[PDB]
Design a protein around this ligand. Structure first.
Ligand SMILES: *[C@@H]1O[C@H](CO)[C@@H](O[C@@H]2O[C@H](CO)[C@@H](O)[C@H](O)[C@H]2NC(C)=O)[C@H](O)[C@H]1NC(C)=O
Ligand SMILES: *[C@@H]1O[C@H](CO)[C@@H](O[C@@H]2O[C@H](CO)[C@@H](O)[C@H](O)[C@H]2NC(C)=O)[C@H](O)[C@H]1NC(C)=O
Ligand SMILES: *[C@@H]1O[C@H](CO)[C@@H](O[C@@H]2O[C@H](CO)[C@@H](O)[C@H](O)[C@H]2NC(C)=O)[C@H](O)[C@H]1NC(C)=O
Ligand SMILES: *[C@@H]1O[C@H](CO)[C@@H](O[C@@H]2O[C@H](CO)[C@@H](O)[C@H](O)[C@H]2NC(C)=O)[C@H](O)[C@H]1NC(C)=O
Ligand SMILES: *[C@@H]1O[C@H](CO)[C@@H](O[C@@H]2O[C@H](CO)[C@@H](O)[C@H](O)[C@H]2NC(C)=O)[C@H](O)[C@H]1NC(C)=O
Ligand SMILES: *[C@@H]1O[C@H](CO)[C@@H](O)[C@H](O)[C@H]1NC(C)=O
Lengths: 106, 50, 170
């Protein structure tokens, strides 16, 4: 409706008997392949991203935002637990880091 | 000639692969929309008869 | 072919030119309408040969290779259910190319989500695309993943009911 791509903002310009809209939009570029999974199986529990998506570059698993590649360590802060690993089709095994775990150790 | 609809692209779909963008382009596009016309009035008596 | 009639018709001026120009404007407007509706993508996408979409069935909406018209069964049913100086100009886009455009749109929305409409086509598995759509309406991803088989069965049943309802209602 407001240009091709994900619309960011627009500018109006007067024209003789008309209006010209300058639509400023965001276009994704330089896409890269990753191996993806719906959920992470850890300790008999299924982990799902709160807002992102699980990606893998071949050896390591990360969670990133959907519209930009920004890999982060899969933790409990950005994932939520629902059910076990027996129901979700295509769940893979990976560790889930706990930020609280080094705190009580020391 | 018989016109081509578009360039042919085959999407590399599989059940466990995703494509994630690593960069972006800020694209500005133009959209021109007419708003009004010239306001014309015709004197019917003067046009037909003077 | 009466020359006297045309000689008398020349007294009325350029009425025929105005009628031809109005009909020409309508005729190009129809092609513009079809161009705006169907030609919204400049890349012709195709589905993969293996139809592994996590249990989701699109055979009723994807093009049938067995048919020479390369139409879907639903589109074939739709085409079957629709039945002196006069000329009919052919449309600029034939039915085969409009079917090809719809096939490209279907392949894009199945294999790439909504990403192809905003830029380059970014591939994503269909049970992940469905989860993204579930998150768009405010339902968590786990609900989609746990009940993926039931949702796929409901979707296939609904598509079959759509085909039956179109075939059974005049
Ligand atoms: C996937 O990405 C991770 C994160 O960058 C890579 O892990 C690092 O790899 C470099 C180079 O091999 C090492 O120097 C680092 O020590 C690694 N970090 C950790 C925490 O192990 C990983 O190698 C990448 N895998 C592939 C296949 O590209
Ligand atoms: C992911 O982890 C689970 C749990 O550790 C694995 O399930 C076990 O698989 C072994 C190998 O056949 C069985 O002997 C165990 O009985 C299984 N345990 C349970 C609780 O089911 C699973 O195989 C792992 N998957 C991968 C791909 O590594
Ligand atoms: C992701 O991987 C797929 C397949 O591994 C790539 O698709 C191939 O791309 C090359 C070059 O563009 C083509 O010659 C092949 O025909 C493609 N294969 C298929 C099955 O379509 C794809 O290019 C990769 N993504 C990126 C961004 O490079
Ligand atoms: C993302 O894209 C931008 C441009 O689209 C890249 O910026 C270019 O970077 C190269 C080398 O760093 C320069 O020679 C160009 O002049 C830059 N162009 C502009 C317009 O600034 C940027 O490097 C890309 N980033 C990544 C991570 O790929
Ligand atoms: C998708 O739906 C189609 C249509 O119902 C299925 O095709 C049927 O398959 C059965 C079993 O082979 C046949 O007895 C029917 O005659 C087929 N119907 C038609 C219209 O072809 C198809 O099996 C479903 N699944 C897949 C993976 O395509
Ligand atoms: C994905 O496909 C491969 C081969 O096509 C298959 O081995 C695997 O089980 C599939 N995974 C899921 C979750 O469907």
């Amino acid at each position: 409706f407001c240009g091709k791509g994900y619309h960011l903002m627009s500018f109006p310009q007067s024209a003789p008997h008309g209006v010209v809209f300058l639509h400023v939009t965001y276009v994704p570029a330089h896409e890269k392949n990753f191996t993806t999974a719906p959920a992470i199986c850890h300790d008999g529990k299924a982990h799902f991203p709160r807002e992102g998506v699980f990606v893998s570059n071949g050896t390591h698993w990360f969670v990133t935002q959907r519209n930009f590649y920004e890999p982060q360590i899969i933790t409990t802060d950005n994932t939520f637990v629902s059910g076990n690993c027996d129901v979700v089709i295509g769940i893979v095994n990976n560790t889930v880091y706990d930020p609280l775990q080094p705190e009580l150790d020391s | 000639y018989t016109m081509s609809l578009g360039a042919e692209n085959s999407v590399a779909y599989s059940n466990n692969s995703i494509a994630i963008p690593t960069n972006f382009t800020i694209s500005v596009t133009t959209e021109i929309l007419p708003v009004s016309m010239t306001k014309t009035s015709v004197d019917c008596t003067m046009y037909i008869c003077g | 072919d009466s020359t006297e009639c045309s000689n008398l018709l020349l007294q009325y001026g350029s009425f025929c030119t105005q009628l031809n120009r109005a009909l020409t404007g309508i005729a190009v407007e129809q092609d513009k309408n079809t161009q705006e509706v169907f030609a919204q993508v400049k890349q012709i996408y195709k589905t993969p040969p293996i139809k592994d979409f996590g249990g989701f069935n699109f055979s009723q909406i994807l093009p049938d290779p067995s048919k020479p018209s390369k139409r879907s069964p639903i589109e074939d049913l739709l085409f079957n259910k629709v039945t002196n100086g006069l000329t009919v100009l052919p449309p600029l886009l034939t039915d085969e190319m409009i079917a090809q455009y719809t096939s490209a749109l279907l392949a894009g929305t199945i294999t790439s989500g909504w990403t192809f409409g905003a830029g380059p086509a970014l591939q994503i598995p269909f049970p992940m695309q469905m989860a993204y759509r579930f998150n768009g309406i405010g339902v968590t991803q786990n609900v989609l993943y746990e009940n993926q088989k039931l949702i796929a069965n409901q979707f296939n049943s609904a598509i079959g009911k759509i085909q039956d309802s179109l075939s059974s209602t005049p």
